[PDB]
Amino acid sequence: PRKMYSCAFETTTKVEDCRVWAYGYMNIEDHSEYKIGNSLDEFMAWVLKVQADLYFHNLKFAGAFIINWLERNGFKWSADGLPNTYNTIISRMGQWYMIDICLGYKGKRKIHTVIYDSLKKLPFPVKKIAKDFKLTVLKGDIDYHKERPVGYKITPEEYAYIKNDIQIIAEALLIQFKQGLDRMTAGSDSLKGFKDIITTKKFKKVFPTLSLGLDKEVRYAYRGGFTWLNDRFKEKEIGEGMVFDVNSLYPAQMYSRLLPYGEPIVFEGKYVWDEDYPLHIQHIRCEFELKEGYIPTIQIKRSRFYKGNEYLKSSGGEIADLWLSNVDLELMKEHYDLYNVEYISGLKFKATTGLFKDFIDKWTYIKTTSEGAIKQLAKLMLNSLYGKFASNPDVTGKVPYLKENGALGFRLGEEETKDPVYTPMGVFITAWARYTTITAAQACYDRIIYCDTDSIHLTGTEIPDVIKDIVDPKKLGYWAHESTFKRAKYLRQKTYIQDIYMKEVDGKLVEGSPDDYTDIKFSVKCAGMTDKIKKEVTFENFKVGFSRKMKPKPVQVPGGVVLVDDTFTIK
DNA sequence: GACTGCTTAC
DNA sequence: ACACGTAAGCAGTC
Distance between CA A233 and CA A448 in Å, rounded? Predict the structure, then answer.
């Protein structure tokens, strides 16, 4: 039997002086078995003997400290699992999944302690896990800036906070492991849950392995959310308005859209219609013009002519090279005039609906019928599945080492390649989401202000008639009226403020309407702006210019990581 | 269009 | 071996 522990560090804040001042571990399966202490050597002496699986929330962070120690106490990075070495899975993007510390072997069997990221299983802050999973959480936090020299003694209150953090996550992990969700990541749990229901044998045949060449081509057609500000509202304080968003955008598409499967057939030129293979990805080159009355939908990245975040009113005298799904292209043909179109090549796929039916209604049932923890875990299964079909088969890692200056650096290791899952499915799921949002926006063209992925922001407070049929606050894939606002200011993409109408229901501040409301609530959405800076935003100062030197930046230094204060400015 | 290394929005 | 993202954005290095 292999033991699991929930762990945490607290650490100092000086660049010149970065160390652990307290540590905690708790047996996930026996919360009475735990220890708080003030020494890394002591923690790490234990790490090297428990021969168990450890979890930290945000392994990226405690990890820098762990590897700084390992490197100064006789360990080296090795992918081959030798004695006195450590292996890691750290992605190209600097996301941390594992630290495997090998001590040796008894017979064939490895003797080691593996450290994981509980954030990868439970992707929220600890405070929120507590609230949502109905677990005990203390209000407030440890005083972060506070002088703590070597041999600082942990106070009773800090012991309290440290014990509570590790317990919140112990209790949560355990509920998850008990539910069957034992894999490394929330995403791995979903996909395994989905494979379980359709069976591995069928999965392999319905979702075959494409070559790296084809996968890369399918991937040129893989895009995310539609994020668009109607430019007539740009940097202009408006009055009343309202926000609708879809109920579970992605699962909604998975439940009922025509989605691709099986071994694709490659074609040259322009796709020719085929009932048996009715979905396709088409490579074209063309010019185009937005028609009057229509929202733009063509966004061109990775070219020296745009400006990859703009949705374009026109191709501006240049030939646009793009790989598109048939959903993209059908929308695009209806919003634009496309001309001088060169149809190069493409793949076509067979298709069906309800490949995800059994999965989705299983966990939706579990969601509708359960409270707190299990309810959350059921949301987690539903929402973590689709992202995972389009997994990049390039798993080239990052390898840690100590730079000559005592701090932790990173080099890219060898090219590694895993088998492609089923990237076309990812292409179409997100294609359908976009179509859903854009056609709703366009139906409300005379009122639209903004969209971001699953949201449409409209002027005025009455529900528009074209939308009235597909609006319901609960039904999957329908639009829910989630808020109404008194006034708003949209600066650019992912950058807006709203004064939301709220009201008191059971003494709680919950969204209301303009013939209801008891109160207003200021709300700041602004990518890259950390919550402390948001408090400084007001309606008057929220504009290109706004700048505050209050932004934490984590920097590598000898010993570990330290948050340093940086500036955030709207440019 | 292509640095690194990080943030939030969804 | 084990490993969901895309998108839009700021600041500092060389």
Answer: 9
Q: Which residue's CA is nearest to the C1' of nucleotide C11?
A: A567
Q: How far is the CA of A68 from the C1' of C13 (A)?
A: 24
Q: How remote is the C-alpha of A454 from its chain's centroid? A: 15
What resolution in angstroms, rounded to 1 decimal? 2.6
Specify burial of residue A11 (Cβ count, 10 A radius: 0-12, 13-18, 19+): buried
Whether A303 sits with its Cβ under 7 A from any strand B atom: the answer reads yes
Domains of chain A: 1-184 (3.30.420.10), 185-257+422-527 (3.90.1600.10), 258-355 (3.30.1770.10), 356-391 (1.10.287.690), 392-421 (4.10.80.20), 528-571 (4.10.80.30)
Q: How far apart are CA A98 and CA A66, in angstroms?
A: 12
A367 is in an annotated binding site: yes
Chain centroid, CA A111 distance in Å? 34
Q: Is A452 annotated as a binding residue?
A: yes
Residue with tokens 């708080």: A36
Secondary structure letter of residue A464 according to DSSP:
P
Tokens of A351: 């298709």
Contacts 24+ apart (CB under 8 A), A350-354: A350/A260, A350/A261, A350/A262, A350/A276, A350/A277, A350/A278, A350/A279, A351/A258, A351/A259, A351/A260, A351/A261, A351/A277, A351/A278, A351/A279, A352/A258, A352/A259, A352/A261, A353/A256, A353/A257, A353/A258, A353/A259, A354/A255, A354/A256
Query: What was the elucidation method?
Result: X-ray
